[PDB]
mmCIF file of C-alpha atoms and ligand atoms in Angstrom:
data_model
loop_
_atom_site.group_PDB
_atom_site.id
_atom_site.type_symbol
_atom_site.label_atom_id
_atom_site.label_comp_id
_atom_site.label_asym_id
_atom_site.label_seq_id
_atom_site.Cartn_x
_atom_site.Cartn_y
_atom_site.Cartn_z
ATOM 1 C CA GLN T 8 31.917 -70.088 34.390
ATOM 2 C CA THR T 9 32.621 -68.888 31.258
ATOM 3 C CA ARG T 10 36.510 -70.161 31.582
ATOM 4 C CA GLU T 11 34.954 -73.688 32.530
ATOM 5 C CA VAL T 12 34.202 -74.494 28.761
ATOM 6 C CA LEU T 13 36.934 -72.330 27.568
ATOM 7 C CA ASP T 14 40.491 -73.988 29.195
ATOM 8 C CA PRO T 15 40.241 -77.361 28.703
ATOM 9 C CA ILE T 16 39.176 -76.998 25.072
ATOM 10 C CA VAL T 17 42.826 -74.393 24.984
ATOM 11 C CA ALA T 18 44.590 -77.066 27.183
ATOM 12 C CA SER T 19 43.754 -79.914 24.704
ATOM 13 C CA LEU T 20 44.881 -77.658 21.934
ATOM 14 C CA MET T 21 47.992 -76.374 23.028
ATOM 15 C CA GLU T 22 49.019 -80.442 24.153
ATOM 16 C CA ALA T 23 47.977 -81.589 20.818
ATOM 17 C CA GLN T 24 49.687 -78.573 18.323
ATOM 18 C CA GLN T 25 52.779 -78.113 21.000
ATOM 19 C CA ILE T 26 51.972 -74.643 21.352
ATOM 20 C CA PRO T 27 54.152 -73.279 23.543
ATOM 21 C CA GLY T 28 51.565 -69.459 24.830
ATOM 22 C CA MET T 29 48.051 -68.634 24.423
ATOM 23 C CA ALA T 30 46.464 -65.325 24.778
ATOM 24 C CA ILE T 31 42.492 -65.448 24.299
ATOM 25 C CA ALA T 32 39.714 -63.001 24.127
ATOM 26 C CA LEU T 33 36.158 -63.778 24.679
ATOM 27 C CA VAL T 34 33.746 -60.447 23.669
ATOM 28 C CA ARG T 35 30.146 -61.014 24.557
ATOM 29 C CA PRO T 36 27.113 -58.341 25.625
ATOM 30 C CA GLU T 37 28.373 -57.531 29.453
ATOM 31 C CA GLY T 38 31.823 -58.196 28.743
ATOM 32 C CA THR T 39 34.999 -59.122 27.564
ATOM 33 C CA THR T 40 36.925 -62.462 29.144
ATOM 34 C CA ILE T 41 40.826 -62.348 28.772
ATOM 35 C CA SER T 42 42.841 -65.363 29.598
ATOM 36 C CA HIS T 43 46.601 -66.168 29.135
ATOM 37 C CA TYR T 44 48.038 -69.505 28.956
ATOM 38 C CA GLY T 45 51.986 -70.919 28.634
ATOM 39 C CA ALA T 46 54.781 -69.614 27.860
ATOM 40 C CA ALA T 47 55.605 -66.512 25.686
ATOM 41 C CA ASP T 48 59.140 -67.752 24.935
ATOM 42 C CA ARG T 49 59.579 -71.793 25.190
ATOM 43 C CA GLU T 50 63.069 -70.746 25.913
ATOM 44 C CA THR T 51 63.022 -68.109 28.381
ATOM 45 C CA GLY T 52 59.920 -69.621 30.561
ATOM 46 C CA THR T 53 58.682 -66.488 30.622
ATOM 47 C CA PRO T 54 54.274 -66.796 30.761
ATOM 48 C CA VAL T 55 52.153 -65.054 28.649
ATOM 49 C CA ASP T 56 50.347 -61.892 30.084
ATOM 50 C CA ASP T 57 48.403 -58.854 29.744
ATOM 51 C CA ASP T 58 51.678 -57.424 27.777
ATOM 52 C CA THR T 59 52.554 -60.134 25.692
ATOM 53 C CA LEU T 60 52.893 -59.222 21.849
ATOM 54 C CA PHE T 61 52.024 -61.677 18.973
ATOM 55 C CA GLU T 62 52.774 -61.550 15.938
ATOM 56 C CA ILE T 63 49.112 -61.645 13.928
ATOM 57 C CA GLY T 64 50.426 -61.819 10.303
ATOM 58 C CA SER T 65 47.330 -61.507 8.168
ATOM 59 C CA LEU T 66 44.889 -60.752 11.064
ATOM 60 C CA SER T 67 46.777 -56.987 10.296
ATOM 61 C CA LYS T 68 44.658 -56.829 6.908
ATOM 62 C CA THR T 69 41.695 -56.337 8.754
ATOM 63 C CA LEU T 70 42.921 -52.900 10.472
ATOM 64 C CA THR T 71 44.134 -51.825 6.432
ATOM 65 C CA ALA T 72 40.503 -52.600 5.433
ATOM 66 C CA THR T 73 39.091 -50.399 8.945
ATOM 67 C CA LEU T 74 41.274 -47.541 7.939
ATOM 68 C CA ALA T 75 40.286 -47.908 4.217
ATOM 69 C CA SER T 76 36.926 -47.859 5.105
ATOM 70 C CA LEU T 77 37.046 -44.703 7.332
ATOM 71 C CA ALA T 78 38.378 -42.706 4.674
ATOM 72 C CA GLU T 79 35.584 -43.845 2.559
ATOM 73 C CA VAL T 80 33.446 -42.806 5.405
ATOM 74 C CA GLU T 81 34.373 -39.507 5.322
ATOM 75 C CA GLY T 82 34.650 -38.438 1.983
ATOM 76 C CA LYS T 83 38.548 -38.558 0.881
ATOM 77 C CA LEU T 84 38.361 -41.914 -1.379
ATOM 78 C CA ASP T 85 35.816 -43.470 -3.894
ATOM 79 C CA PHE T 86 35.892 -47.371 -3.096
ATOM 80 C CA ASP T 87 34.926 -48.348 -6.973
ATOM 81 C CA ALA T 88 37.440 -45.403 -8.229
ATOM 82 C CA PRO T 89 40.355 -46.672 -10.396
ATOM 83 C CA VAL T 90 43.073 -46.635 -7.773
ATOM 84 C CA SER T 91 45.249 -44.300 -10.373
ATOM 85 C CA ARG T 92 42.930 -42.017 -9.307
ATOM 86 C CA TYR T 93 44.649 -41.581 -5.740
ATOM 87 C CA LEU T 94 47.769 -42.710 -7.192
ATOM 88 C CA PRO T 95 48.613 -40.918 -10.001
ATOM 89 C CA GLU T 96 52.070 -42.356 -10.649
ATOM 90 C CA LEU T 97 49.849 -45.372 -11.621
ATOM 91 C CA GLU T 98 48.112 -43.536 -14.263
ATOM 92 C CA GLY T 99 47.943 -45.812 -17.297
ATOM 93 C CA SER T 100 48.767 -49.150 -15.942
ATOM 94 C CA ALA T 101 46.273 -51.602 -14.698
ATOM 95 C CA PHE T 102 45.252 -49.779 -12.125
ATOM 96 C CA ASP T 103 43.296 -47.182 -14.537
ATOM 97 C CA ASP T 104 40.805 -50.526 -14.225
ATOM 98 C CA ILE T 105 41.274 -51.834 -10.767
ATOM 99 C CA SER T 106 39.539 -50.483 -7.820
ATOM 100 C CA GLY T 107 40.052 -49.767 -3.925
ATOM 101 C CA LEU T 108 36.812 -52.482 -3.571
ATOM 102 C CA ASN T 109 38.578 -54.657 -5.673
ATOM 103 C CA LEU T 110 41.768 -54.441 -3.669
ATOM 104 C CA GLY T 111 40.029 -54.906 -0.305
ATOM 105 C CA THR T 112 38.177 -57.738 -1.349
ATOM 106 C CA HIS T 113 41.583 -59.852 -3.834
ATOM 107 C CA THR T 114 39.684 -59.418 -6.842
ATOM 108 C CA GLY T 115 42.322 -57.163 -8.581
ATOM 109 C CA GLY T 116 42.944 -58.952 -11.811
ATOM 110 C CA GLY T 117 44.958 -61.800 -10.990
ATOM 111 C CA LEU T 118 47.450 -59.588 -8.858
ATOM 112 C CA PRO T 119 49.631 -62.234 -6.985
ATOM 113 C CA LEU T 120 50.120 -63.317 -3.608
ATOM 114 C CA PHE T 121 53.613 -62.396 -2.743
ATOM 115 C CA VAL T 122 55.792 -59.376 -3.004
ATOM 116 C CA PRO T 123 58.711 -60.398 -6.014
ATOM 117 C CA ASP T 124 62.072 -60.189 -5.414
ATOM 118 C CA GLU T 125 62.949 -57.513 -7.187
ATOM 119 C CA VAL T 126 61.040 -55.389 -5.429
ATOM 120 C CA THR T 127 63.132 -53.787 -2.770
ATOM 121 C CA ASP T 128 61.301 -50.224 -2.065
ATOM 122 C CA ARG T 129 58.542 -48.089 -2.437
ATOM 123 C CA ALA T 130 60.251 -47.052 -5.781
ATOM 124 C CA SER T 131 61.265 -50.333 -6.643
ATOM 125 C CA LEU T 132 57.350 -51.296 -6.128
ATOM 126 C CA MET T 133 55.534 -48.542 -7.977
ATOM 127 C CA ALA T 134 57.536 -49.390 -11.178
ATOM 128 C CA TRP T 135 56.480 -53.485 -10.662
ATOM 129 C CA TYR T 136 52.935 -52.238 -10.737
ATOM 130 C CA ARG T 137 53.628 -49.561 -13.474
ATOM 131 C CA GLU T 138 54.391 -52.788 -15.652
ATOM 132 C CA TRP T 139 52.231 -55.536 -13.986
ATOM 133 C CA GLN T 140 49.461 -57.582 -16.911
ATOM 134 C CA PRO T 141 46.039 -58.571 -15.364
ATOM 135 C CA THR T 142 45.783 -62.708 -15.466
ATOM 136 C CA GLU T 143 42.052 -62.901 -14.346
ATOM 137 C CA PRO T 144 38.912 -60.915 -15.551
ATOM 138 C CA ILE T 145 38.872 -57.904 -12.570
ATOM 139 C CA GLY T 146 36.005 -58.026 -10.062
ATOM 140 C CA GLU T 147 35.299 -62.134 -11.345
ATOM 141 C CA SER T 148 38.087 -63.479 -9.714
ATOM 142 C CA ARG T 149 39.861 -63.658 -6.627
ATOM 143 C CA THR T 150 43.392 -64.191 -5.841
ATOM 144 C CA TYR T 151 44.483 -63.609 -2.044
ATOM 145 C CA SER T 152 47.092 -61.076 -2.708
ATOM 146 C CA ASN T 153 49.595 -59.134 -0.482
ATOM 147 C CA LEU T 154 50.116 -56.909 -3.100
ATOM 148 C CA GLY T 155 46.757 -55.837 -3.372
ATOM 149 C CA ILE T 156 45.871 -54.862 0.310
ATOM 150 C CA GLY T 157 49.375 -53.301 0.387
ATOM 151 C CA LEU T 158 48.389 -51.020 -2.497
ATOM 152 C CA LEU T 159 45.186 -50.867 -0.828
ATOM 153 C CA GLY T 160 47.447 -49.567 2.287
ATOM 154 C CA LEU T 161 49.068 -47.077 0.124
ATOM 155 C CA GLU T 162 45.637 -45.689 -1.530
ATOM 156 C CA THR T 163 44.887 -45.030 1.965
ATOM 157 C CA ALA T 164 47.655 -42.936 3.560
ATOM 158 C CA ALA T 165 47.524 -41.316 -0.105
ATOM 159 C CA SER T 166 43.899 -40.182 0.004
ATOM 160 C CA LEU T 167 44.518 -39.132 3.578
ATOM 161 C CA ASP T 168 47.449 -37.318 2.818
ATOM 162 C CA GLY T 169 49.663 -38.588 5.640
ATOM 163 C CA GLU T 170 52.060 -42.211 6.111
ATOM 164 C CA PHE T 171 50.279 -45.489 6.733
ATOM 165 C CA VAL T 172 51.117 -46.355 10.282
ATOM 166 C CA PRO T 173 51.200 -42.608 11.572
ATOM 167 C CA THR T 174 47.573 -42.359 10.579
ATOM 168 C CA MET T 175 46.204 -45.906 11.460
ATOM 169 C CA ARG T 176 47.612 -44.689 15.083
ATOM 170 C CA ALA T 177 45.785 -41.625 14.828
ATOM 171 C CA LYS T 178 42.526 -42.362 13.215
ATOM 172 C CA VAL T 179 41.577 -46.408 13.666
ATOM 173 C CA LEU T 180 43.942 -47.657 16.888
ATOM 174 C CA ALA T 181 44.182 -44.637 19.193
ATOM 175 C CA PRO T 182 40.081 -44.548 19.257
ATOM 176 C CA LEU T 183 39.888 -47.556 19.395
ATOM 177 C CA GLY T 184 42.037 -47.355 22.617
ATOM 178 C CA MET T 185 44.384 -50.663 21.051
ATOM 179 C CA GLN T 186 47.904 -48.648 22.687
ATOM 180 C CA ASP T 187 49.549 -52.421 22.925
ATOM 181 C CA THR T 188 49.381 -52.905 19.414
ATOM 182 C CA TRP T 189 52.278 -52.167 17.441
ATOM 183 C CA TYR T 190 54.067 -52.435 13.515
ATOM 184 C CA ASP T 191 57.634 -51.599 15.399
ATOM 185 C CA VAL T 192 57.560 -52.732 18.464
ATOM 186 C CA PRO T 193 59.332 -50.162 20.877
ATOM 187 C CA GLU T 194 62.567 -50.946 23.139
ATOM 188 C CA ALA T 195 60.584 -50.710 26.044
ATOM 189 C CA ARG T 196 58.477 -53.661 24.422
ATOM 190 C CA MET T 197 60.938 -56.037 23.547
ATOM 191 C CA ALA T 198 60.832 -58.245 26.935
ATOM 192 C CA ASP T 199 56.839 -58.196 26.105
ATOM 193 C CA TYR T 200 57.272 -59.562 22.351
ATOM 194 C CA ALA T 201 56.713 -63.729 22.029
ATOM 195 C CA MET T 202 59.081 -65.081 20.500
ATOM 196 C CA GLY T 203 57.385 -67.567 17.489
ATOM 197 C CA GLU T 204 58.340 -71.608 17.289
ATOM 198 C CA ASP T 205 58.210 -72.827 14.025
ATOM 199 C CA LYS T 206 56.412 -76.203 12.603
ATOM 200 C CA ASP T 207 60.026 -77.757 13.453
ATOM 201 C CA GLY T 208 60.199 -76.569 16.958
ATOM 202 C CA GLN T 209 63.140 -73.510 15.847
ATOM 203 C CA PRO T 210 62.567 -70.307 17.237
ATOM 204 C CA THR T 211 61.449 -67.326 14.855
ATOM 205 C CA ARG T 212 60.552 -64.028 14.450
ATOM 206 C CA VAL T 213 58.903 -62.133 11.702
ATOM 207 C CA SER T 214 61.045 -59.918 9.170
ATOM 208 C CA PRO T 215 60.403 -56.484 7.860
ATOM 209 C CA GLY T 216 59.670 -56.328 4.455
ATOM 210 C CA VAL T 217 58.118 -54.475 1.841
ATOM 211 C CA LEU T 218 54.104 -53.595 2.308
ATOM 212 C CA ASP T 219 54.354 -55.073 5.950
ATOM 213 C CA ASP T 220 52.796 -53.312 7.580
ATOM 214 C CA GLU T 221 49.880 -53.161 5.303
ATOM 215 C CA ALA T 222 49.682 -56.684 5.086
ATOM 216 C CA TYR T 223 51.120 -58.733 7.955
ATOM 217 C CA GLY T 224 53.371 -56.449 10.161
ATOM 218 C CA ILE T 225 50.893 -56.333 13.234
ATOM 219 C CA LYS T 226 52.215 -57.245 17.375
ATOM 220 C CA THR T 227 49.421 -56.784 19.695
ATOM 221 C CA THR T 228 47.586 -58.120 22.640
ATOM 222 C CA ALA T 229 44.730 -60.424 22.352
ATOM 223 C CA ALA T 230 42.830 -57.776 24.387
ATOM 224 C CA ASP T 231 43.409 -55.322 21.824
ATOM 225 C CA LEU T 232 41.922 -57.396 18.612
ATOM 226 C CA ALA T 233 39.314 -58.095 21.136
ATOM 227 C CA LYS T 234 38.515 -54.127 20.789
ATOM 228 C CA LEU T 235 38.157 -53.986 17.041
ATOM 229 C CA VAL T 236 36.275 -56.902 17.113
ATOM 230 C CA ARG T 237 33.695 -55.828 21.032
ATOM 231 C CA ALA T 238 33.409 -52.288 17.765
ATOM 232 C CA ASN T 239 32.451 -54.788 15.372
ATOM 233 C CA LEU T 240 30.395 -56.448 17.670
ATOM 234 C CA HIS T 241 28.214 -53.266 18.631
ATOM 235 C CA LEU T 242 29.547 -53.064 22.328
ATOM 236 C CA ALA T 243 31.698 -50.705 21.899
ATOM 237 C CA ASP T 244 31.257 -46.780 22.414
ATOM 238 C CA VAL T 245 33.229 -45.047 19.444
ATOM 239 C CA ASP T 246 32.349 -41.830 16.956
ATOM 240 C CA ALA T 247 30.144 -42.194 14.708
ATOM 241 C CA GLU T 248 32.759 -41.775 11.542
ATOM 242 C CA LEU T 249 34.497 -44.917 12.991
ATOM 243 C CA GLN T 250 32.079 -46.783 13.960
ATOM 244 C CA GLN T 251 30.385 -46.775 10.185
ATOM 245 C CA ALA T 252 33.549 -47.083 8.908
ATOM 246 C CA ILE T 253 33.979 -50.436 10.650
ATOM 247 C CA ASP T 254 30.522 -51.375 10.106
ATOM 248 C CA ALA T 255 31.299 -50.796 6.281
ATOM 249 C CA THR T 256 34.136 -53.091 6.375
ATOM 250 C CA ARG T 257 31.731 -56.550 7.258
ATOM 251 C CA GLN T 258 29.565 -55.529 4.099
ATOM 252 C CA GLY T 259 29.407 -58.623 1.720
ATOM 253 C CA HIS T 260 30.903 -57.502 -1.714
ATOM 254 C CA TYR T 261 31.946 -60.899 -3.492
ATOM 255 C CA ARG T 262 29.715 -64.461 -3.191
ATOM 256 C CA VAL T 263 33.277 -67.090 -3.561
ATOM 257 C CA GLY T 264 31.526 -70.566 -3.801
ATOM 258 C CA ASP T 265 30.115 -70.818 -0.111
ATOM 259 C CA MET T 266 32.087 -68.129 1.059
ATOM 260 C CA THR T 267 31.726 -64.325 1.049
ATOM 261 C CA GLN T 268 33.905 -61.771 0.554
ATOM 262 C CA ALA T 269 33.657 -58.129 2.655
ATOM 263 C CA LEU T 270 36.040 -55.755 3.159
ATOM 264 C CA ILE T 271 38.542 -58.563 3.886
ATOM 265 C CA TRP T 272 36.660 -60.584 6.488
ATOM 266 C CA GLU T 273 35.081 -63.527 5.461
ATOM 267 C CA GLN T 274 31.742 -64.834 5.884
ATOM 268 C CA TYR T 275 29.305 -67.355 5.604
ATOM 269 C CA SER T 276 25.463 -67.933 6.509
ATOM 270 C CA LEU T 277 24.488 -69.347 9.285
ATOM 271 C CA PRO T 278 24.267 -72.627 10.217
ATOM 272 C CA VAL T 279 27.862 -73.438 8.919
ATOM 273 C CA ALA T 280 29.252 -76.596 8.754
ATOM 274 C CA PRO T 281 32.987 -76.670 9.971
ATOM 275 C CA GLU T 282 34.222 -78.109 6.712
ATOM 276 C CA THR T 283 33.106 -75.534 4.927
ATOM 277 C CA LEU T 284 35.526 -73.352 6.733
ATOM 278 C CA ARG T 285 38.343 -75.579 6.664
ATOM 279 C CA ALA T 286 38.065 -75.099 2.889
ATOM 280 C CA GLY T 287 37.749 -71.530 2.904
ATOM 281 C CA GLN T 288 41.409 -71.395 4.814
ATOM 282 C CA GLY T 289 42.849 -74.101 2.429
ATOM 283 C CA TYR T 290 45.092 -74.629 -0.359
ATOM 284 C CA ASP T 291 42.183 -74.680 -3.234
ATOM 285 C CA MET T 292 40.595 -71.428 -1.329
ATOM 286 C CA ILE T 293 44.160 -69.372 -0.294
ATOM 287 C CA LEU T 294 46.596 -70.213 -3.780
ATOM 288 C CA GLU T 295 44.153 -71.053 -6.322
ATOM 289 C CA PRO T 296 41.949 -68.078 -8.273
ATOM 290 C CA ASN T 297 37.749 -68.635 -7.345
ATOM 291 C CA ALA T 298 35.503 -66.915 -9.414
ATOM 292 C CA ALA T 299 33.865 -64.295 -7.564
ATOM 293 C CA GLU T 300 30.511 -62.800 -8.132
ATOM 294 C CA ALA T 301 29.550 -59.087 -6.743
ATOM 295 C CA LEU T 302 26.628 -58.621 -4.909
ATOM 296 C CA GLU T 303 24.791 -56.383 -6.964
ATOM 297 C CA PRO T 304 22.028 -55.560 -4.673
ATOM 298 C CA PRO T 305 24.787 -55.065 -2.628
ATOM 299 C CA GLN T 306 24.551 -56.204 0.944
ATOM 300 C CA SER T 307 23.820 -54.512 4.450
ATOM 301 C CA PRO T 308 26.048 -56.387 7.320
ATOM 302 C CA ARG T 309 24.581 -59.589 8.142
ATOM 303 C CA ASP T 310 23.135 -60.251 11.479
ATOM 304 C CA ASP T 311 22.786 -63.964 10.632
ATOM 305 C CA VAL T 312 26.684 -64.980 9.993
ATOM 306 C CA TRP T 313 30.186 -66.506 10.847
ATOM 307 C CA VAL T 314 32.648 -63.723 10.325
ATOM 308 C CA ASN T 315 35.858 -64.628 10.121
ATOM 309 C CA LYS T 316 39.824 -63.927 9.746
ATOM 310 C CA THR T 317 43.207 -66.321 10.077
ATOM 311 C CA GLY T 318 46.375 -64.556 10.470
ATOM 312 C CA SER T 319 49.854 -66.723 10.380
ATOM 313 C CA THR T 320 53.483 -65.672 10.698
ATOM 314 C CA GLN T 321 55.913 -68.565 10.541
ATOM 315 C CA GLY T 322 56.206 -68.902 14.037
ATOM 316 C CA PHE T 323 52.546 -67.662 15.133
ATOM 317 C CA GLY T 324 49.012 -68.226 14.011
ATOM 318 C CA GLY T 325 45.780 -66.299 15.217
ATOM 319 C CA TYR T 326 42.199 -66.652 14.084
ATOM 320 C CA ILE T 327 39.379 -63.859 15.002
ATOM 321 C CA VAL T 328 35.295 -64.969 15.120
ATOM 322 C CA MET T 329 32.372 -62.809 15.019
ATOM 323 C CA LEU T 330 29.021 -63.740 15.729
ATOM 324 C CA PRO T 331 27.220 -60.253 15.038
ATOM 325 C CA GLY T 332 23.835 -62.269 15.745
ATOM 326 C CA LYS T 333 24.546 -63.173 19.244
ATOM 327 C CA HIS T 334 26.666 -59.878 19.899
ATOM 328 C CA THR T 335 29.947 -62.255 20.479
ATOM 329 C CA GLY T 336 33.489 -63.242 19.251
ATOM 330 C CA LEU T 337 36.340 -64.934 20.090
ATOM 331 C CA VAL T 338 39.996 -63.981 19.740
ATOM 332 C CA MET T 339 43.106 -66.487 19.580
ATOM 333 C CA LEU T 340 46.339 -65.913 19.814
ATOM 334 C CA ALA T 341 49.143 -68.481 19.703
ATOM 335 C CA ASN T 342 52.739 -68.409 19.177
ATOM 336 C CA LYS T 343 52.746 -71.206 16.828
ATOM 337 C CA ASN T 344 52.113 -71.367 13.193
ATOM 338 C CA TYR T 345 49.875 -74.235 13.726
ATOM 339 C CA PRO T 346 46.961 -75.986 11.323
ATOM 340 C CA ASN T 347 43.900 -73.668 9.919
ATOM 341 C CA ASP T 348 41.912 -76.865 11.117
ATOM 342 C CA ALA T 349 42.575 -76.900 14.495
ATOM 343 C CA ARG T 350 41.877 -73.541 14.857
ATOM 344 C CA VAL T 351 38.459 -73.888 13.130
ATOM 345 C CA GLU T 352 37.769 -76.736 15.652
ATOM 346 C CA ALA T 353 38.582 -75.392 18.489
ATOM 347 C CA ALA T 354 37.036 -72.721 17.739
ATOM 348 C CA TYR T 355 33.864 -73.815 16.890
ATOM 349 C CA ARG T 356 33.933 -76.152 19.886
ATOM 350 C CA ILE T 357 34.396 -72.662 22.438
ATOM 351 C CA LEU T 358 31.586 -71.291 20.377
ATOM 352 C CA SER T 359 29.011 -74.155 20.384
ATOM 353 C CA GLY T 360 30.100 -75.071 24.560
ATOM 354 C CA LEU T 361 29.132 -71.561 24.786
ATOM 355 C CA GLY T 362 25.671 -71.840 23.347
ATOM 356 C CA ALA T 363 26.476 -69.383 20.717
ATOM 357 C CA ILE T 364 26.070 -72.001 17.946
HETATM 358 CA CA1 CA C 1 31.869 -44.200 -6.320
HETATM 359 CA CA1 CA C 2 61.021 -62.897 -1.505
HETATM 360 CA CA1 CA C 3 57.288 -50.679 6.376
HETATM 361 CA CA1 CA C 4 24.722 -50.726 -9.172
HETATM 362 CA CA1 CA C 5 38.796 -83.233 16.281
HETATM 363 CL CL1 CL C 6 54.415 -60.455 0.627
#
């Protein structure tokens, strides 16, 4: 059916990219279709199924954004306020001049991509933030930053008077029914935890690290990510405040060339060419500063857009696409870090084959 469109495209993709296993969710009005392909671990051959956990890498950032947005809806976090208003340990630093919004849109003054090696824990991280000098004009330049979205998670946790993961669990994951979503995979689920395969065909699994939970640490199922997508598409029955928080994550905040930066979510007006999508996931967007123009007639969530986010670790590659105007979404998780361009092509062919574009 829907499977007749999906199955050949994923077979072709997994063959071409030598991906051991995939889990895919297709979200539409009148329902969600879950499909599993291949092996969760190439070296045991254990199949991908309902319980298989995939590393989603930077897709974790969408959950971080959602929690921040919920704190904002609850009146506990002001997105345009200086981050030092909620983390007074950073008073007198650059974070007097950088907001939660800047952090959620990668416009925090050129804040760098990676946590530096001299930062090993929360104390050394805060010391590093206190000393750091902005290298770009705050709110006028975008640099993709684990440090920034990480700090947004810490700011959110402070504003909610709780710790990041328990707070995430209580306020976002549990209400969405995301009960297969883990920051630290329990012993009892280790048999479900897919093994990654890197670009050389070697097994690999993500290591813990500072700001891991906020930036890249989730292991989850396609089905759980589909719940977050369903809610984004107004197809879920969720509490009003959570729904509002989720809707606000899709508000466009900056124009960045052809891309609109929402709260972590990245979006494009329809029709969108795949080449534009590809440009969004390459060196020039991800590894250079890009000029960013605040959207000052501040836009409402749009119904005529391609909304997306990639996520990877060394051994995994995930992609989410949402088409709010079609009430359709796609979640693709793989245990190989395969090229972003191939993620775009496969998503586009699936969605075109389904008539959604
Ligand atoms: Ca304000
Ligand atoms: Ca390092
Ligand atoms: Ca952690
Ligand atoms: Ca204004
Ligand atoms: Ca092609
Ligand atoms: Cl990092």
